[PDB]
Design a protein around this ligand. Sequence first.
Ligand code: W0X
Ligand code: W0X
Lengths: 300, 237
Amino acid sequence: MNTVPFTSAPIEVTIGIDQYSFNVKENQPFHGIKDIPIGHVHVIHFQHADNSSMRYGYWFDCRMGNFYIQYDPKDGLYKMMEERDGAKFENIVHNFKERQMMVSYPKIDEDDTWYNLTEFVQMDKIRKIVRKDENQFSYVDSSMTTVQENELSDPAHSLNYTVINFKSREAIRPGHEMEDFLDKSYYLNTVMLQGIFKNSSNYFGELQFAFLNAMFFGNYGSSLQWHAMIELICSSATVPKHMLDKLDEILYYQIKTLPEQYSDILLNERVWNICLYSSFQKNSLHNTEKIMENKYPELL
Amino acid sequence: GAMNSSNYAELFNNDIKLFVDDTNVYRVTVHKTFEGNVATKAINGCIFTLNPKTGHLFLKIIHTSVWAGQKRLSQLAKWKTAEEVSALVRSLPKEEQPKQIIVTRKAMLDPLEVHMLDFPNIAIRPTELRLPFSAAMSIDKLSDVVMKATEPQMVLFNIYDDWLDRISSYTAFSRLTLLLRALKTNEESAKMILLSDPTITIKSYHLWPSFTDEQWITIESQMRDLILTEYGRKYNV
Ligand SMILES: O=C(O)CCS(=O)(=O)Cc1cccc(Br)c1
Ligand SMILES: O=C(O)CCS(=O)(=O)Cc1cccc(Br)c1
């Protein structure tokens, strides 16, 4: 198991660590989170009690370094940093562990939620969407725009998702206008899967990362990206049967995890109704269709 | 965006623009089969592509062979229209290409946009106007060339005959739309009005008769009365 230490908690803050949320009071003796399960990316995120503006957080992987959190009173946020002195680090963590100043990530042995939401997510691909190369972890927040959004404004602070646009020359072969527009299989399988992503696991990784960024930071661009990538598969007549079975599972656990009070803004009625009831793959998402009907029948 | 009664003068400024109407592209007659089912039989149609400023009409004739062995014909019609328009634009020299293409029905917007991705500076737009262009097949010489056609064929016309020598495009357009609405609402009466006087005649190189200015006023008056008459008949007034 591994750990993320905090010099301190100077401002009252709601801290998130993957799908868990808990509150820290101004100057309560909090020094961090222990027993984080090795083997998965993680995300530690923040919402200041006093200013709900800007949810922000950090994507990291404990196998890539020793990371800690220290509040920066100039920039006004909890910053992630890497301690290169491994020995300084174990010493510090042991002290706080001994004094029991760390809350305990409760890994449950009948819960696969986090695995099921991050199966295809890999820190190396995150670091290509979020460009900040002198760090092994990746900052995201509420307001970061995506490359595509900055085509319709600082590029350093943007999310480089793979642009998808159904009415572009990339999506539409000359002389196959109607064919490619009503059946997107060319765009899915040759352009995106064989061309850009190389395999379906990197496509699913971006799709999952997109969803998590929407859900955890309320990032509007990420939400668009997550729907765009669902729609491209659902709108293709020809999709490997393994992709559909897996897509069904992925969405199911996304739908399962979404807070009920946030579905009116994070789910796009058009995309889902099309995908579940009109698209080529209408019959192919049984598990997703069952949880969507039973949980958010309102949306349909 | 969309075109309406607020920016109605835009049609007659100096930016090349075309209307595209696909209503008469796919045309069918419906009849009973021997076994008592219903079957369709397609007939020739046409794409109606009009420059409202000059009166130039690019009448692309749609031969029934186009449909042979195809599925989902009403939807293909929209994509066949978009392809024809796109090919027409591409055959025009650059300085003759439209800046705008206005489609008369919203279902045409995506097919045309996708076919025109190569032309990112050409705006593709809907209109809130209800334009009576479906009645173009009530014009006899257009109906004639469409039904006679044995093959795909592009035929060029000026739907204003010579009117622009004497009036503005704004007025020619008004007259054309009033004539076409009349023909759509009651085609037989509309035509009677145009040939009730046997002395006035249609030049072989025209579509509409050779009315004096004074006779056009009278005609215009009679067409408005017809539309009004049909409105009353319709709603009981
Ligand atoms: O210069 C400073 O203010 C910080 C140096 S330091 O306190 O060692 C940082 C750090 C290392 C290891 C665990 C944790 Br908690 C944080
Ligand atoms: O519904 C939720 O999200 C809250 C469950 S919970 O509070 O997250 C459990 C928990 C408590 C305290 C630290 C940690 Br880490 C996890």
